[PDB]
Design an enzyme around this catalytic site. Structure first.
Site, PDB file in Angstrom:
ATOM      1  N   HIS A 257      29.534  27.408  28.993  1.00 39.20           N
ATOM      2  CA  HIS A 257      28.365  27.829  27.880  1.00 39.20           C
ATOM      3  C   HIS A 257      27.864  27.416  26.644  1.00 39.20           C
ATOM      4  O   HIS A 257      28.748  27.157  25.239  1.00 39.20           O
ATOM      5  CB  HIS A 257      28.097  29.326  27.545  1.00 39.20           C
TER       6      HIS A 257
ATOM      7  N   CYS B 173      45.694  34.379  48.120  1.00 38.62           N
ATOM      8  CA  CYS B 173      45.261  35.618  47.983  1.00 38.62           C
ATOM      9  C   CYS B 173      46.436  36.636  48.831  1.00 38.62           C
ATOM     10  O   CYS B 173      46.132  36.933  49.836  1.00 38.62           O
ATOM     11  CB  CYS B 173      44.359  36.150  47.961  1.00 38.62           C
TER      12      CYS B 173
ATOM     13  N   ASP C 136      22.422  35.339  24.767  1.00 34.93           N
ATOM     14  CA  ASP C 136      22.647  34.565  25.189  1.00 34.93           C
ATOM     15  C   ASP C 136      23.015  34.351  26.653  1.00 34.93           C
ATOM     16  O   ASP C 136      22.396  34.004  27.379  1.00 34.93           O
ATOM     17  CB  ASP C 136      23.246  33.133  24.989  1.00 34.93           C
TER      18      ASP C 136
HETATM   19  S1  FES Z   1      43.950  36.281  43.605  1.00 36.55           S
HETATM   20 FE1  FES Z   1      43.594  37.985  44.685  1.00 36.55          FE
HETATM   21  S2  FES Z   1      41.395  36.547  44.286  1.00 36.55           S
HETATM   22 FE2  FES Z   1      42.627  34.997  43.165  1.00 36.55          FE
END
Ligand code: FES
Ligand SMILES: C=CC1=C(C)c2cc3[nH]c(cc4nc(cc5[nH]c(cc1n2)c(C)c5C=C)C(C)=C4CCC(=O)O)c(CCC(=O)O)c3C
Ligand SMILES: C[C@H](CCC(=O)O)[C@H]1CC[C@H]2[C@@H]3[C@H](O)C[C@@H]4C[C@H](O)CC[C@]4(C)[C@H]3C[C@H](O)[C@]12C
Ligand SMILES: C[C@H](CCC(=O)O)[C@H]1CC[C@H]2[C@@H]3[C@H](O)C[C@@H]4C[C@H](O)CC[C@]4(C)[C@H]3C[C@H](O)[C@]12C
Ligand SMILES: C[C@H](CCC(=O)O)[C@H]1CC[C@H]2[C@@H]3[C@H](O)C[C@@H]4C[C@H](O)CC[C@]4(C)[C@H]3C[C@H](O)[C@]12C
Ligand code: FES
EC number: 4.98.1.1
Lengths: 359, 359
Positions: free
Chosen positions: B166, B342, B319
């Site tokens: 930003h 993940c 903003d």
């Molecule tokens: S650890 Fe699950 S999305 Fe990054």
């Protein structure tokens, strides 16, 4: 009319034929900067002899050798065409190829440049993002050449040692991503997940201050901004070899990973290099998009075209050089800072060779 | 006029007093989002009782506790003043503080927002650079809550889950840097080396897919652009703990390295946080800039001022929201993509919670 301004295009290089494979491994392994071996003058030639088959096989599977010389040349020709037009007081321009590990060797090209009696020489790395393993090495090769030979340079030198966010570089990338997106089935365009794949580093080099990861990260962001964040992305790293820790995630692991989690439309975007070479033609297109992707349940997988002969990359090259001449810069501000944890007495020497140049 | 739009400012927290140190640690160690300890419900109460004296002593060394809330509060009042004048359609704007590990906790904040009958709730992370350990964890809490509580949200939800680049955030860092460069002796300004210092992540988090490094690096680049590369830099990472491998270079190692190579003028720029906290007032200002650099031979080490009360940062915050609101987005495109490696089942659920809000 005799050449005024030389442009030395620096790249690591690749074996042109399968016959060039052994001598390429030899130079790679003889290099104390890159690797430190016990009895190095005995091991290097034997390690190379043993690795040659494995590596010939890789070029075999892409058609018998590297194309970086063809593309590097084709880029060179367009660049020079343009520059002589953009910058007459510095014309005529010539390009020279300085591969690090294959003919024409960095040292060979410098030898020619001096021979042609140029007035000004610009060392121009073809890696947009600086690493001491790549650009760092080419720059050292130049300093070493003039130390090795024990004579002064007869030309006024400088360098464009990096340029990870060049506006036209950014454009070429976005255009190639976009047009490759248009090749995914319409019902999946929105679902496409982007993987920026760059050559990884060993952690030990990263931990030492190598400027690469931050710069490659800089490039990705700039490209994504130009794409107006149209699809989600990730920056991942390819080319780990051997048991030591390198920077992650691994491009391959990331492909498998996403597939296991239902993200089965992956576009691969080679962000760390400007032309095809082994890392795209074998690693990404074959070992990853072919096999792996087959055994993970992939749906579509694609690889944005490398910049290659795109005329817009030509423009990019001429623009950089042109501006660099207009600025009287001798090297980026960045080059004036060596990695905080650098061992290697030569880095300082090279940095001094460039900042100390006449004018 | 009762509040209409609610702005939940998310952040990790830090004990407001020596007496809060215990519960803070107890809550960190109970997080299944960050620590997989055996018999976790028994280990963490112990591992806190144990670490508490170390951590207290640190806060002592900085006057007695964390300034985080004082700054978050102020930054928030300024944001709201401005919002009420920028977007009068959203009616009165109220800011709520949701800290992850101290009161007022995200949970508590959500209760208060609920029983205010807002029309709109915005999960605003105060971490420009997204990590699953920071912003993700905050976001998981928002979901986890409305799931545990069995009720469903009674107000429209959405998130500004990131904002690494930003432009007004960039102006702030660059502005503080310039200001800090005028405190160096004139004669040494150009010789000043910049280290941007971001809280590090363990290699296993990086290797798993975490967004953080690439985003932090994005910010560094934009900031350096604005400064037109006036001094050289590196991005380095602070706060490693334990024996496992973390993303480096460690900031301390870098200071000490530069110093041993004769780069003895250094400006630390904390680039991943927006107030003073322990990491700056203790880690940077005391262990690093006092003890360490004193026994290394440093001539000048300063630290760019945290964003704190800068009125222009308030504008930035307002903003970001005004734009978030007008554009109608629910979250970033980036949030709609999880880490390729993940392993946490809630990340899917949390994403869904945001991608799939009504309106
Ligand atoms: S650890 Fe699950 S999305 Fe990054
Ligand atoms: C998984 C990735 C991360 C892990 C596992 C992590 C773990 C920790 N973070 C801690 C404190 C902290 N972490 C903090 C900001 C961040 N922390 C971040 C990423 C992580 N932080 C990022 C990214 C941050 C922002 C840039 C702050 C401000 C503290 C304050 C700790 C204290 O002493 O109050 C502590 C205290 C531990 C101890 O005993 O000293 C641990 C273990
Ligand atoms: C993997 C390869 C052996 C090939 C084979 O057994 O087929 C060996 C020989 C020389 C090695 C390299 C050298 O040890 C130098 C580097 C040092 C780093 O800590 C590891 C990677 C590093 C870049 C090495 C990668 C890899 O292990 C190499 C290339
Ligand atoms: C060719 C050999 C792999 C051998 C094998 O797999 O057995 C690899 C291992 C380490 C490699 C090097 C490391 O990746 C570091 C450099 C990275 C650049 O992208 C290419 C040159 C670079 C200098 C590499 C040259 C070559 O690809 C090496 C030496
Ligand atoms: C060193 C300290 C324990 C010391 C003690 O019992 O007194 C431990 C307790 C919990 C630990 C954390 C947990 O093991 C979870 C994480 C696991 C990663 O491999 C390293 C970071 C990681 C975040 C750890 C950092 C560090 O090793 C911590 C903070
Ligand atoms: S290793 Fe990077 S400067 Fe020497």
């Amino acid at each position: 009319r005799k050449p005024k301004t030389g442009i030395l295009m620096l790249n690591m290089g690749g074996p042109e034929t399968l016959g060039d494979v052994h001598d390429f491994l030899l130079r790679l392994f003889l290099d104390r900067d890159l690797m430190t071996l016990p009895i190095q003058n005995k091991l290097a030639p034997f390690i190379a002899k043993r690795r040659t088959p494995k590596i010939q096989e890789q070029y075999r599977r892409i058609g018998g050798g590297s194309p970086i010389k063809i593309w590097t040349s084709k880029q060179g020709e367009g660049m020079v065409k343009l520059l002589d037009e953009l910058s007459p007081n510095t014309a005529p321009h010539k390009y020279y190829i300085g591969f690090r590990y294959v003919h024409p060797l960095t040292e060979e090209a410098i030898e020619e440049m001096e021979r042609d009696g140029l007035e000004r020489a610009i060392a121009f790395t073809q890696y947009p993002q600086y690493s001491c393993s790549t650009t760092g090495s080419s720059l050292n090769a130049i300093y070493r050449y003039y130390n090795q030979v024990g004579r002064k340079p007869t030309m006024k030198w400088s360098t464009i040692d990096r340029w990870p966010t060049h506006h036209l570089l950014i454009q070429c990338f976005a255009d190639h991503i976009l047009k490759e997106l248009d090749h995914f089935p319409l019902e999946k365009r929105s679902e496409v997940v982007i993987l920026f794949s760059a050559h990884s580093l060993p952690m030990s080099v990263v931990n030492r201050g190598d400027p690469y990861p931050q710069e490659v990260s800089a490039t990705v962001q700039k490209v994504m901004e130009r794409l107006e964040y149209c699809n989600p992305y990730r920056l991942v790293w390819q080319s780990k070899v051997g048991p030591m820790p390198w920077l992650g995630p691994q491009t391959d692991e990331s492909i498998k990973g996403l597939c296991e989690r239902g993200r089965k439309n992956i576009l691969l975007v080679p962000i760390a290099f400007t032309s095809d070479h082994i890392d795209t033609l074998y690693e990404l297109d074959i070992e990853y998009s072919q096999v792996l992707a087959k055994e993970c349940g992939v749906e579509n997988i694609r690889r944005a075209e490398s910049l290659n002969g795109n005329p817009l990359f030509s423009k990019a090259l001429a623009d950089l050089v042109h501006s660099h001449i207009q600025s009287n810069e001798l090297c980026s501000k960045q080059l004036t800072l060596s990695c905080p944890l650098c061992v290697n007495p030569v880095c300082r020497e090279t940095k001094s060779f460039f900042t100390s140049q006449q004018l």
